[PDB]
Structure 1
Protein backbone atom coordinates (compact mmCIF):
# COMPACT_ATOMS: atom_id res chain seq x y z
CA UNK A 1 0.00 0.00 0.00
CA UNK A 2 1.13 3.56 -0.84
CA UNK A 3 1.93 4.51 2.77
CA UNK A 4 4.26 1.51 3.19
CA UNK A 5 7.65 0.71 1.68
CA UNK A 6 8.46 -2.99 2.03
CA UNK A 7 12.02 -3.48 3.24
CA UNK A 8 12.07 -7.27 2.95
CA UNK A 9 10.06 -10.48 3.11
CA UNK A 10 9.94 -11.92 6.64
CA UNK A 11 8.34 -15.17 5.54
CA UNK A 12 5.27 -17.00 4.32
CA UNK A 13 2.48 -17.04 6.87
CA UNK A 14 -0.62 -19.20 7.20
CA UNK A 15 -2.69 -16.32 5.83
CA UNK A 16 -0.27 -14.82 3.33
CA UNK A 17 3.13 -13.21 2.85
CA UNK A 18 4.56 -11.22 5.77
CA UNK A 19 6.70 -8.19 5.00
CA UNK A 20 8.84 -5.98 7.23
CA UNK A 21 7.85 -2.49 6.17
CA UNK A 22 8.18 1.16 7.03
CA UNK A 23 5.24 3.51 7.44
CA UNK A 24 6.10 6.59 5.37
CA UNK A 25 4.02 8.99 7.48
CA UNK A 26 5.29 7.81 10.88
CA UNK A 27 8.66 6.23 10.16
CA UNK A 28 7.75 3.21 12.27
CA UNK A 29 8.84 -0.20 11.02
CA UNK A 30 6.10 -2.79 11.13
CA UNK A 31 5.07 -6.30 10.10
CA UNK A 32 2.65 -6.14 7.17
CA UNK A 33 0.51 -9.15 6.30
CA UNK A 34 -1.52 -9.57 3.13
CA UNK A 35 -4.60 -11.78 3.41
CA UNK A 36 -5.90 -13.61 0.31
CA UNK A 37 -11.54 -14.25 -3.43
CA UNK A 38 -14.95 -12.67 -2.83
CA UNK A 39 -14.02 -9.28 -1.40
CA UNK A 40 -13.64 -10.17 2.27
CA UNK A 41 -16.88 -10.90 4.20
CA UNK A 42 -18.23 -8.39 6.71
CA UNK A 43 -17.92 -10.99 9.47
CA UNK A 44 -14.15 -11.22 9.00
CA UNK A 45 -13.97 -7.42 9.13
CA UNK A 46 -15.78 -7.14 12.47
CA UNK A 47 -13.84 -9.99 14.09
CA UNK A 48 -10.57 -8.33 13.13
CA UNK A 49 -11.78 -4.92 14.28
CA UNK A 50 -12.45 -6.45 17.69
CA UNK A 51 -8.82 -7.58 17.77
CA UNK A 52 -7.69 -3.97 17.40
CA UNK A 53 -8.91 -3.50 20.97
CA UNK A 54 -7.48 -6.44 22.90
CA UNK A 55 -4.14 -4.92 23.71
CA UNK A 56 -1.65 -6.46 26.13
CA UNK A 57 2.16 -6.30 26.65
CA UNK A 58 2.48 -9.95 25.65
CA UNK A 59 0.24 -9.78 22.60
CA UNK A 60 1.75 -8.43 19.37
CA UNK A 61 -0.13 -5.18 18.82
CA UNK A 62 -2.37 -4.91 15.77
CA UNK A 63 -1.59 -1.38 14.58
CA UNK A 64 -3.98 -0.97 11.66
CA UNK A 65 -6.43 -2.83 9.45
CA UNK A 66 -6.41 -1.61 5.87
CA UNK A 67 -9.27 -2.76 3.66
CA UNK A 68 -8.58 -1.18 0.26
CA UNK A 69 -9.41 -2.23 -3.30
CA UNK A 70 -11.26 -5.19 -1.81
CA UNK A 71 -8.03 -6.45 -0.25
CA UNK A 72 -7.11 -7.10 3.38
CA UNK A 73 -3.82 -5.96 4.89
CA UNK A 74 -2.98 -6.23 8.58
CA UNK A 75 -0.27 -4.05 10.10
CA UNK A 76 1.38 -5.40 13.25
CA UNK A 77 3.98 -4.21 15.72
CA UNK A 78 7.34 -5.56 14.51
CA UNK A 79 9.59 -7.85 16.61
CA UNK A 80 13.05 -8.97 15.48
CA UNK A 81 12.82 -12.72 16.04
CA UNK A 82 10.58 -15.72 16.67
CA UNK A 83 11.09 -18.52 19.20
CA UNK A 84 11.75 -21.00 16.38
CA UNK A 85 14.94 -19.33 15.17
CA UNK A 86 15.91 -18.49 18.73
CA UNK A 87 15.62 -22.16 19.69
CA UNK A 88 17.61 -23.33 16.67
CA UNK A 89 20.23 -20.77 17.68
CA UNK A 90 20.29 -22.12 21.25
CA UNK A 91 20.44 -25.79 20.26
CA UNK A 92 23.97 -26.32 21.60
CA UNK A 93 23.34 -25.46 25.26
CA UNK A 94 19.60 -24.90 25.12
CA UNK A 95 17.64 -21.93 26.40
CA UNK A 96 18.52 -21.39 30.08
CA UNK A 97 15.73 -22.57 32.38
CA UNK A 98 15.32 -19.09 33.97
CA UNK A 99 14.61 -17.71 30.52
CA UNK A 100 12.34 -20.64 29.69
CA UNK A 101 10.33 -19.94 32.82
CA UNK A 102 10.19 -16.22 32.02
CA UNK A 103 8.90 -16.86 28.51
CA UNK A 104 6.31 -19.43 29.65
CA UNK A 105 5.22 -17.06 32.42
CA UNK A 106 4.65 -14.18 29.99
CA UNK A 107 2.91 -16.37 27.42
CA UNK A 108 0.46 -17.52 30.08
CA UNK A 109 -0.22 -13.86 30.97
CA UNK A 110 -1.04 -13.06 27.36
CA UNK A 111 -3.23 -16.14 27.18
CA UNK A 112 -5.02 -15.32 30.44
CA UNK A 113 -5.87 -11.89 29.03
CA UNK A 114 -7.22 -13.08 25.68
CA UNK A 115 -9.03 -16.01 27.25
CA UNK A 116 -10.69 -13.69 29.77
CA UNK A 117 -12.14 -11.91 26.72
CA UNK A 118 -13.21 -15.22 25.17
CA UNK A 119 -10.65 -14.90 22.38
CA UNK A 120 -8.43 -17.88 21.53
CA UNK A 121 -5.47 -18.26 19.18
CA UNK A 122 -6.09 -21.86 18.05
CA UNK A 123 -2.73 -22.09 16.29
CA UNK A 124 0.12 -21.39 18.71
CA UNK A 125 3.59 -22.44 17.57
CA UNK A 126 7.23 -21.28 17.85
CA UNK A 127 6.81 -19.36 14.60
CA UNK A 128 4.22 -16.94 16.02
CA UNK A 129 5.89 -16.38 19.38
CA UNK A 130 7.99 -13.24 18.95
CA UNK A 131 10.76 -11.95 21.19
CA UNK A 132 12.64 -8.65 21.55
CA UNK A 133 16.00 -7.64 23.01
CA UNK A 134 14.41 -6.77 26.36
CA UNK A 135 13.52 -10.27 27.56
CA UNK A 136 9.91 -10.08 26.36
CA UNK A 137 8.01 -12.63 24.30
CA UNK A 138 4.67 -12.00 22.59
CA UNK A 139 1.83 -13.88 20.92
CA UNK A 140 1.37 -12.99 17.24
CA UNK A 141 -1.64 -13.50 14.94
CA UNK A 142 -3.97 -13.93 17.88
CA UNK A 143 -7.59 -14.45 16.84
CA UNK A 144 -6.96 -14.64 13.10
CA UNK A 145 -7.97 -18.32 13.01
CA UNK A 146 -11.60 -17.61 13.94
CA UNK A 147 -11.60 -14.69 11.50
CA UNK A 148 -10.40 -16.95 8.66
CA UNK A 149 -10.92 -20.71 8.45
CA UNK A 150 -7.41 -22.11 8.91
CA UNK A 151 -6.31 -24.09 5.78
CA UNK A 152 -4.41 -27.39 5.71
CA UNK A 153 -1.89 -26.10 3.16
CA UNK A 154 -0.82 -22.45 2.87
CA UNK A 155 -1.14 -20.39 -0.32
CA UNK A 156 2.58 -21.12 -0.70
CA UNK A 157 1.66 -24.81 -0.69
CA UNK A 158 3.57 -25.14 2.58
CA UNK A 159 2.20 -27.75 4.96
CA UNK A 160 0.81 -26.26 8.17
CA UNK A 161 2.24 -27.94 11.27
CA UNK A 162 0.05 -30.20 13.45
CA UNK A 163 2.72 -30.56 16.12
CA UNK A 164 0.91 -28.25 18.56
CA UNK A 165 -2.68 -29.27 17.84
CA UNK A 166 -4.77 -30.37 20.84
CA UNK A 167 -6.31 -33.88 20.79
CA UNK A 168 -9.91 -32.63 20.95
CA UNK A 169 -9.27 -31.01 17.57
CA UNK A 170 -7.60 -34.06 16.05
CA UNK A 171 -10.60 -36.09 17.23
CA UNK A 172 -13.13 -33.90 15.45
CA UNK A 173 -14.50 -31.72 18.25
CA UNK A 174 -15.87 -28.72 16.33
CA UNK A 175 -16.10 -26.41 19.33
CA UNK A 176 -12.62 -25.59 20.60
CA UNK A 177 -12.25 -23.94 23.99
CA UNK A 178 -9.39 -21.88 25.37
CA UNK A 179 -7.93 -25.23 26.43
CA UNK A 180 -6.47 -25.78 22.97
CA UNK A 181 -4.04 -22.92 23.56
CA UNK A 182 -2.90 -24.36 26.89
CA UNK A 183 -2.14 -27.65 25.16
CA UNK A 184 -0.15 -25.91 22.42
CA UNK A 185 1.82 -23.94 25.00
CA UNK A 186 2.56 -27.07 26.99
CA UNK A 187 3.97 -28.70 23.84
CA UNK A 188 6.14 -25.63 23.23
CA UNK A 189 7.21 -25.61 26.90
CA UNK A 190 8.37 -29.22 26.55
CA UNK A 191 10.19 -28.37 23.31
CA UNK A 192 12.19 -25.54 24.93
CA UNK A 193 13.30 -27.86 27.74
CA UNK A 194 14.30 -30.91 25.69
CA UNK A 195 15.28 -28.93 22.56
CA UNK A 196 13.21 -31.33 20.48
CA UNK A 197 9.59 -31.15 19.35
CA UNK A 198 7.30 -33.15 21.65
CA UNK A 199 4.91 -34.56 19.01
CA UNK A 200 6.44 -34.14 15.46
CA UNK A 201 3.42 -35.56 13.63
CA UNK A 202 3.42 -35.48 9.82
CA UNK A 203 -0.26 -36.45 9.43
CA UNK A 204 -3.30 -36.26 11.69
CA UNK A 205 -3.20 -39.93 12.51
CA UNK A 206 0.58 -39.84 13.02
CA UNK A 207 0.10 -36.78 15.21
CA UNK A 208 -2.66 -38.49 17.16
CA UNK A 209 -0.71 -41.71 17.61
CA UNK A 210 2.44 -39.93 18.74
CA UNK A 211 0.32 -38.27 21.43
CA UNK A 212 -1.17 -41.65 22.36
CA UNK A 213 2.31 -43.24 22.62
CA UNK A 214 3.64 -40.73 25.14
CA UNK A 215 0.51 -40.02 27.22
CA UNK A 216 -1.22 -43.35 26.70
CA UNK A 217 -4.31 -43.97 24.57
CA UNK A 218 -7.20 -42.04 26.18
CA UNK A 219 -10.25 -43.87 27.50
CA UNK A 220 -13.48 -42.99 29.31
CA UNK A 221 -11.69 -43.06 32.66
CA UNK A 222 -9.27 -40.19 31.97
CA UNK A 223 -11.47 -38.49 29.35
CA UNK A 224 -15.26 -38.92 29.65
CA UNK A 225 -16.89 -38.76 26.22
CA UNK A 226 -13.70 -39.50 24.33
CA UNK A 227 -15.11 -42.62 22.64
CA UNK A 228 -18.12 -40.64 21.44
CA UNK A 229 -16.04 -38.14 19.50
CA UNK A 230 -16.38 -37.84 15.68
CA UNK A 231 -12.98 -39.27 14.75
CA UNK A 232 -12.49 -41.59 17.67
CA UNK A 233 -12.21 -45.20 16.50
CA UNK A 234 -12.69 -48.16 18.87
CA UNK A 235 -9.93 -49.70 16.76
CA UNK A 236 -7.29 -47.25 18.06
CA UNK A 237 -4.19 -49.07 19.30
CA UNK A 238 -4.02 -49.16 23.12
CA UNK A 239 -0.71 -47.69 24.33
CA UNK A 240 0.50 -47.21 27.91
CA UNK A 241 1.37 -43.80 29.33
CA UNK A 242 5.10 -43.09 29.50
CA UNK A 243 6.28 -41.44 32.70
CA UNK A 244 7.06 -37.72 32.45
CA UNK A 245 10.46 -38.13 34.08
CA UNK A 246 11.26 -39.93 30.83
CA UNK A 247 9.51 -37.42 28.58
CA UNK A 248 11.07 -34.14 29.71
CA UNK A 249 14.31 -34.53 31.62
CA UNK A 250 15.84 -32.56 33.19
CA UNK A 251 12.74 -30.45 34.00
CA UNK A 252 12.23 -30.41 37.77
CA UNK A 253 9.23 -31.69 39.71
CA UNK A 254 7.35 -28.36 39.60
CA UNK A 255 7.78 -28.06 35.84
CA UNK A 256 6.75 -31.65 35.23
CA UNK A 257 3.76 -31.19 37.52
CA UNK A 258 2.69 -28.07 35.61
CA UNK A 259 3.40 -29.61 32.19
CA UNK A 260 1.23 -32.59 33.10
CA UNK A 261 -1.71 -30.31 33.83
CA UNK A 262 -1.26 -28.38 30.58
CA UNK A 263 -1.31 -31.76 28.82
CA UNK A 264 -4.41 -33.37 30.38
CA UNK A 265 -6.50 -35.13 27.73
CA UNK A 266 -9.87 -33.89 28.99
CA UNK A 267 -10.18 -30.23 27.90
CA UNK A 268 -12.17 -29.46 31.05
CA UNK A 269 -9.47 -30.88 33.33
CA UNK A 270 -6.67 -29.07 31.51
CA UNK A 271 -5.34 -26.21 33.64
CA UNK A 272 -6.33 -22.68 32.62
CA UNK A 273 -3.79 -19.92 31.94
CA UNK A 274 -4.92 -18.13 35.11
CA UNK A 275 -4.49 -21.13 37.42
CA UNK A 276 -1.21 -21.93 35.70
CA UNK A 277 0.20 -18.52 36.68
CA UNK A 278 -0.25 -19.48 40.35
CA UNK A 279 1.58 -22.81 40.00
CA UNK A 280 4.67 -23.38 42.25
CA UNK A 281 6.90 -23.68 39.18
CA UNK A 282 6.77 -19.88 38.89
CA UNK A 283 7.76 -19.34 42.54
CA UNK A 284 11.17 -17.99 41.49
CA UNK A 285 10.37 -16.45 38.09
CA UNK A 286 12.52 -13.56 36.94
CA UNK A 287 12.94 -11.73 33.63
CA UNK A 288 16.38 -12.50 32.12
CA UNK A 289 17.74 -10.77 29.03
CA UNK A 290 18.14 -13.10 26.05
CA UNK A 291 21.37 -13.12 24.11
CA UNK A 292 20.02 -12.02 20.74
CA UNK A 293 22.19 -11.53 17.65
CA UNK A 294 20.27 -9.78 14.89
Structure 2
Protein backbone atom coordinates (compact mmCIF):
# COMPACT_ATOMS: atom_id res chain seq x y z
CA UNK A 1 0.00 0.00 0.00
CA UNK A 2 3.14 2.19 -0.62
CA UNK A 3 2.29 4.52 2.33
CA UNK A 4 -0.76 6.58 1.25
CA UNK A 5 -3.31 8.20 3.59
CA UNK A 6 -6.68 9.95 3.72
CA UNK A 7 -8.20 7.42 1.35
CA UNK A 8 -11.34 8.99 0.11
CA UNK A 9 -13.60 6.83 -2.09
CA UNK A 10 -14.40 8.71 -5.35
CA UNK A 11 -16.59 5.83 -6.51
CA UNK A 12 -16.83 2.55 -8.37
CA UNK A 13 -14.96 2.61 -11.72
CA UNK A 14 -14.76 0.08 -14.58
CA UNK A 15 -12.19 -2.37 -13.08
CA UNK A 16 -12.40 -1.28 -9.44
CA UNK A 17 -12.93 1.33 -6.82
CA UNK A 18 -11.09 4.67 -7.10
CA UNK A 19 -9.94 6.68 -4.09
CA UNK A 20 -8.39 10.09 -3.89
CA UNK A 21 -5.45 9.93 -1.48
CA UNK A 22 -2.29 11.67 -0.49
CA UNK A 23 1.16 10.20 -0.17
CA UNK A 24 3.36 10.73 2.91
CA UNK A 25 4.77 13.81 1.01
CA UNK A 26 1.23 15.25 0.91
CA UNK A 27 0.76 15.19 -2.94
CA UNK A 28 -2.69 14.13 -4.41
CA UNK A 29 -3.21 10.83 -6.34
CA UNK A 30 -6.00 8.59 -7.58
CA UNK A 31 -5.73 4.95 -6.46
CA UNK A 32 -7.56 2.30 -8.40
CA UNK A 33 -7.97 -0.94 -6.36
CA UNK A 34 -8.53 -3.70 -8.98
CA UNK A 35 -11.67 -5.80 -8.33
CA UNK A 36 -10.83 -9.50 -8.66
CA UNK A 37 -13.78 -11.65 -9.61
CA UNK A 38 -11.98 -14.77 -8.32
CA UNK A 39 -9.99 -13.66 -5.26
CA UNK A 40 -8.14 -16.96 -5.09
CA UNK A 41 -6.94 -17.13 -8.72
CA UNK A 42 -4.07 -14.66 -8.34
CA UNK A 43 -2.74 -12.19 -10.97
CA UNK A 44 -0.23 -13.78 -13.39
CA UNK A 45 3.09 -12.15 -14.12
CA UNK A 46 2.18 -11.53 -17.79
CA UNK A 47 -0.72 -9.29 -16.61
CA UNK A 48 1.46 -7.29 -14.26
CA UNK A 49 3.87 -6.81 -17.22
CA UNK A 50 1.05 -5.69 -19.53
CA UNK A 51 -0.12 -3.06 -17.00
CA UNK A 52 3.37 -1.81 -16.13
CA UNK A 53 4.24 -1.10 -19.79
CA UNK A 54 1.50 1.59 -19.52
CA UNK A 55 3.86 3.68 -17.38
CA UNK A 56 5.51 4.45 -20.76
CA UNK A 57 2.34 6.37 -21.86
CA UNK A 58 3.35 9.99 -21.32
CA UNK A 59 1.17 12.45 -23.06
CA UNK A 60 -0.67 15.48 -21.88
CA UNK A 61 -4.07 13.90 -22.71
CA UNK A 62 -3.43 10.42 -21.20
CA UNK A 63 -3.85 9.96 -17.39
CA UNK A 64 -0.33 9.30 -16.07
CA UNK A 65 0.27 5.88 -14.37
CA UNK A 66 2.83 6.38 -11.58
CA UNK A 67 2.93 2.98 -9.86
CA UNK A 68 1.70 -0.59 -9.84
CA UNK A 69 1.22 -1.95 -6.32
CA UNK A 70 0.96 -5.73 -6.13
CA UNK A 71 0.79 -7.30 -2.62
CA UNK A 72 -1.10 -10.51 -1.63
CA UNK A 73 -4.13 -11.02 -3.98
CA UNK A 74 -4.47 -7.18 -3.94
CA UNK A 75 -3.77 -4.89 -6.92
CA UNK A 76 -3.59 -1.08 -6.73
CA UNK A 77 -2.76 1.38 -9.56
CA UNK A 78 -1.57 4.83 -8.64
CA UNK A 79 -2.61 7.50 -11.21
CA UNK A 80 -2.72 11.34 -11.28
CA UNK A 81 -6.00 12.71 -9.94
CA UNK A 82 -8.44 14.80 -11.92
CA UNK A 83 -11.32 16.59 -10.49
CA UNK A 84 -14.25 15.54 -12.69
CA UNK A 85 -15.35 13.35 -15.57
CA UNK A 86 -17.09 14.50 -18.80
CA UNK A 87 -20.20 12.61 -17.76
CA UNK A 88 -20.56 14.72 -14.59
CA UNK A 89 -20.08 17.98 -16.63
CA UNK A 90 -22.54 16.88 -19.35
CA UNK A 91 -25.08 16.08 -16.57
CA UNK A 92 -25.33 19.78 -15.70
CA UNK A 93 -25.01 21.23 -19.21
CA UNK A 94 -28.58 21.41 -20.64
CA UNK A 95 -28.57 20.86 -24.37
CA UNK A 96 -24.89 19.99 -24.37
CA UNK A 97 -21.68 21.96 -24.51
CA UNK A 98 -20.89 25.17 -26.33
CA UNK A 99 -19.36 24.54 -29.73
CA UNK A 100 -15.94 25.92 -28.70
CA UNK A 101 -15.82 23.59 -25.66
CA UNK A 102 -16.81 20.41 -27.59
CA UNK A 103 -14.21 21.20 -30.20
CA UNK A 104 -11.59 21.76 -27.56
CA UNK A 105 -12.46 18.39 -25.84
CA UNK A 106 -12.60 16.45 -29.15
CA UNK A 107 -9.20 17.84 -30.15
CA UNK A 108 -7.65 16.74 -26.88
CA UNK A 109 -9.36 13.32 -27.02
CA UNK A 110 -8.08 12.65 -30.55
CA UNK A 111 -4.60 13.80 -29.64
CA UNK A 112 -4.45 11.27 -26.75
CA UNK A 113 -5.87 8.54 -28.92
CA UNK A 114 -3.45 9.31 -31.82
CA UNK A 115 -0.51 8.96 -29.36
CA UNK A 116 -1.69 5.49 -28.04
CA UNK A 117 -2.68 4.22 -31.51
CA UNK A 118 0.88 5.04 -32.76
CA UNK A 119 2.12 2.67 -30.03
CA UNK A 120 -0.49 -0.05 -30.84
CA UNK A 121 -2.30 0.61 -27.54
CA UNK A 122 -6.12 0.31 -27.85
CA UNK A 123 -8.77 1.50 -25.45
CA UNK A 124 -11.98 -0.28 -26.71
CA UNK A 125 -14.17 1.16 -23.91
CA UNK A 126 -14.10 4.89 -24.42
CA UNK A 127 -17.04 6.60 -22.67
CA UNK A 128 -17.65 10.00 -20.99
CA UNK A 129 -16.87 8.29 -17.60
CA UNK A 130 -13.25 7.81 -18.61
CA UNK A 131 -12.66 11.19 -20.13
CA UNK A 132 -11.37 13.12 -17.10
CA UNK A 133 -11.37 16.95 -16.96
CA UNK A 134 -9.40 19.37 -14.75
CA UNK A 135 -10.37 22.99 -13.85
CA UNK A 136 -8.04 24.41 -16.51
CA UNK A 137 -10.20 22.66 -19.15
CA UNK A 138 -7.64 19.91 -19.91
CA UNK A 139 -9.11 16.52 -20.92
CA UNK A 140 -7.27 13.32 -20.11
CA UNK A 141 -8.26 9.75 -20.97
CA UNK A 142 -8.30 6.99 -18.26
CA UNK A 143 -7.99 3.19 -18.71
CA UNK A 144 -6.21 3.21 -22.10
CA UNK A 145 -4.55 -0.22 -22.49
CA UNK A 146 -6.41 -1.85 -19.59
CA UNK A 147 -8.80 -3.87 -21.81
CA UNK A 148 -5.74 -5.82 -23.07
CA UNK A 149 -4.92 -6.73 -19.40
CA UNK A 150 -8.49 -7.32 -18.11
CA UNK A 151 -10.83 -7.85 -21.13
CA UNK A 152 -24.74 -3.41 -16.05
CA UNK A 153 -22.56 -3.12 -19.20
CA UNK A 154 -22.64 0.08 -21.26
CA UNK A 155 -22.96 -0.80 -24.94
CA UNK A 156 -23.68 2.80 -26.07
CA UNK A 157 -20.14 3.47 -27.50
CA UNK A 158 -19.58 0.04 -29.19
CA UNK A 159 -19.01 -0.23 -32.91
CA UNK A 160 -21.56 -2.32 -34.88
CA UNK A 161 -18.83 -4.81 -36.03
CA UNK A 162 -17.91 -5.41 -32.35
CA UNK A 163 -21.57 -5.88 -31.49
CA UNK A 164 -21.80 -8.46 -34.32
CA UNK A 165 -18.93 -10.45 -32.84
CA UNK A 166 -15.76 -9.09 -34.38
CA UNK A 167 -12.71 -9.83 -32.21
CA UNK A 168 -9.78 -8.58 -34.27
CA UNK A 169 -7.21 -6.04 -32.99
CA UNK A 170 -8.32 -2.72 -34.49
CA UNK A 171 -7.86 0.99 -33.92
CA UNK A 172 -11.18 1.65 -35.74
CA UNK A 173 -13.19 0.70 -32.68
CA UNK A 174 -12.05 3.67 -30.65
CA UNK A 175 -12.91 6.09 -33.49
CA UNK A 176 -16.55 4.92 -33.49
CA UNK A 177 -16.72 5.65 -29.79
CA UNK A 178 -15.26 9.16 -30.39
CA UNK A 179 -17.97 9.87 -33.00
CA UNK A 180 -20.67 8.79 -30.45
CA UNK A 181 -19.09 11.03 -27.76
CA UNK A 182 -18.81 14.00 -30.17
CA UNK A 183 -22.55 13.82 -30.95
CA UNK A 184 -23.34 13.43 -27.18
CA UNK A 185 -21.30 16.58 -26.39
CA UNK A 186 -23.20 18.62 -29.01
CA UNK A 187 -26.74 17.17 -28.49
CA UNK A 188 -26.55 16.91 -24.67
CA UNK A 189 -28.04 13.37 -24.89
CA UNK A 190 -26.42 10.03 -25.85
CA UNK A 191 -26.76 9.27 -29.55
CA UNK A 192 -27.35 5.48 -29.34
CA UNK A 193 -28.49 4.55 -25.77
CA UNK A 194 -29.26 0.83 -26.38
CA UNK A 195 -30.61 -1.55 -23.67
CA UNK A 196 -29.13 -4.76 -25.11
CA UNK A 197 -26.89 -5.84 -28.00
CA UNK A 198 -29.79 -6.29 -30.35
CA UNK A 199 -31.38 -2.97 -29.41
CA UNK A 200 -28.01 -1.12 -29.61
CA UNK A 201 -27.69 -2.28 -33.26
CA UNK A 202 -31.24 -1.24 -33.93
CA UNK A 203 -30.63 2.25 -32.51
CA UNK A 204 -27.63 2.58 -34.73
CA UNK A 205 -29.29 1.29 -37.90
CA UNK A 206 -32.40 3.43 -37.36
CA UNK A 207 -30.23 6.53 -37.62
CA UNK A 208 -27.42 5.50 -40.00
CA UNK A 209 -29.06 2.85 -42.12
CA UNK A 210 -29.05 -0.89 -42.03
CA UNK A 211 -25.77 -2.15 -43.52
CA UNK A 212 -25.72 -4.35 -46.54
CA UNK A 213 -23.15 -5.96 -48.90
CA UNK A 214 -23.10 -2.81 -51.00
CA UNK A 215 -22.45 -0.17 -48.31
CA UNK A 216 -20.35 -2.46 -46.18
CA UNK A 217 -18.76 -5.19 -48.30
CA UNK A 218 -18.12 -8.35 -46.33
CA UNK A 219 -20.52 -7.41 -43.50
CA UNK A 220 -22.11 -10.89 -44.04
CA UNK A 221 -18.94 -12.46 -42.61
CA UNK A 222 -19.48 -11.20 -39.06
CA UNK A 223 -20.50 -14.04 -36.69
CA UNK A 224 -23.70 -12.33 -35.49
CA UNK A 225 -24.66 -10.68 -38.74
CA UNK A 226 -28.36 -11.32 -39.33
CA UNK A 227 -29.75 -11.42 -42.87
CA UNK A 228 -33.18 -10.56 -41.37
CA UNK A 229 -32.20 -7.21 -39.74
CA UNK A 230 -35.02 -4.70 -40.33
CA UNK A 231 -34.15 -2.41 -43.24
CA UNK A 232 -33.86 1.28 -42.41
CA UNK A 233 -32.79 4.09 -44.66
CA UNK A 234 -30.09 6.57 -43.39
CA UNK A 235 -31.43 9.86 -41.96
CA UNK A 236 -29.93 13.26 -43.04
CA UNK A 237 -27.20 14.28 -40.48
CA UNK A 238 -28.64 17.77 -39.96
CA UNK A 239 -31.85 16.11 -38.56
CA UNK A 240 -30.34 14.38 -35.49
CA UNK A 241 -27.41 16.73 -34.98
CA UNK A 242 -27.70 20.28 -33.72
CA UNK A 243 -25.27 23.09 -33.06
CA UNK A 244 -22.78 21.66 -35.51
CA UNK A 245 -21.64 23.57 -38.62
CA UNK A 246 -20.90 21.91 -41.98
CA UNK A 247 -17.33 20.90 -41.18
CA UNK A 248 -18.33 19.37 -37.83
CA UNK A 249 -21.02 17.24 -39.45
CA UNK A 250 -18.57 16.23 -42.13
CA UNK A 251 -15.98 15.17 -39.50
CA UNK A 252 -18.70 13.34 -37.53
CA UNK A 253 -19.92 11.49 -40.68
CA UNK A 254 -16.40 10.15 -41.14
CA UNK A 255 -16.12 8.71 -37.63
CA UNK A 256 -19.52 7.11 -37.83
CA UNK A 257 -18.92 5.10 -41.05
CA UNK A 258 -20.25 1.60 -40.35
CA UNK A 259 -17.56 -0.09 -42.43
CA UNK A 260 -14.43 0.05 -40.24
CA UNK A 261 -12.12 0.06 -43.33
CA UNK A 262 -13.60 3.42 -44.40
CA UNK A 263 -13.60 4.92 -40.92
CA UNK A 264 -11.40 8.05 -40.42
CA UNK A 265 -8.27 7.50 -38.25
CA UNK A 266 -7.39 9.65 -35.18
CA UNK A 267 -4.55 11.46 -37.05
CA UNK A 268 -6.66 12.00 -40.12
CA UNK A 269 -9.36 13.48 -37.91
CA UNK A 270 -6.85 15.95 -36.42
CA UNK A 271 -6.13 17.25 -40.03
CA UNK A 272 -9.79 17.94 -40.74
CA UNK A 273 -10.98 21.51 -41.60
CA UNK A 274 -13.21 21.43 -38.45
CA UNK A 275 -10.12 22.11 -36.36
CA UNK A 276 -8.60 24.86 -38.54
CA UNK A 277 -11.66 26.95 -37.56
Q: TM-score, normalised by structure 2?
A: 0.96
Corresponding residue for residue 270 of structure 2? 277
Deviations 1:144-193 (A, max 9, x none): 111102xxxxxxxxx12111011111010011411111110110000010
2:237 paired with 1:235: no
Q: 2:219 aligns with which of 226, 233, 236?
A: 226
Cα–Cα, structure 1 residues 15 and 6, in superposed 2: closer, same or farther, change >3 Å? farther
The CA deviation at 1:2 is 5.5
The CA deviation at 1:89 is 1.6
Native 8 Å contact 1:44 1:147 kept in 2: yes
2:10 paired with 1:17: no
- 1:52 is paired with a residue whose SS is helix
Corresponding residue for residue 260 of structure 2? 267
Q: 1:129 aligns with which of 131, 136, 140?
A: 131
- Structure 1 runs of 4+ aligned residues shifted over 6 Å read none
2:32 paired with 1:33: yes
- Write the distance in 2 (CA, Å) between the matches of 1:73 and 1:257: 42
- After TM superposition, the structure 1 = structure 2 runs for residues 137-152 of structure 1, keeping only pairs within 5 Å, are 137-149=139-151
The CA deviation at 1:70 is 3.0
Native 8 Å contact 1:105 1:282 kept in 2: yes
Aligned length: 273
Corresponding residue for residue 47 of structure 2? 44
Deviations 1:103-150 (A, max 9, x none): 10010000000000000101000000001111210101111111102x
- Write the distance in 2 (CA, Å) between the matches of 1:108 and 1:161: 21
Native 8 Å contact 1:14 1:160 kept in 2: no
Structure 1: any 5+ residue segments left out of the alignment?
150-158, 285-294
- Write the distance in 2 (CA, Å) between the matches of 1:12 and 1:5: 19
Corresponding residue for residue 248 of structure 2? 255
Native 8 Å contact 1:172 1:231 kept in 2: yes
Corresponding residue for residue 206 of structure 2? 213
Native 8 Å contact 2:110 2:269 kept in 1: yes
- Write the distance in 1 (CA, Å) between the matches of 2:213 and 2:260: 13
Native 8 Å contact 2:126 2:178 kept in 1: yes
Higher relative contact order (CA 8 A, sep 6+): 1
Corresponding residue for residue 96 of structure 1? 98
Q: 1:185 aligns with which of 178, 195, 198?
A: 178
Q: TM-score, normalised by structure 1?
A: 0.90
- 2:52 is paired with a residue whose SS is helix
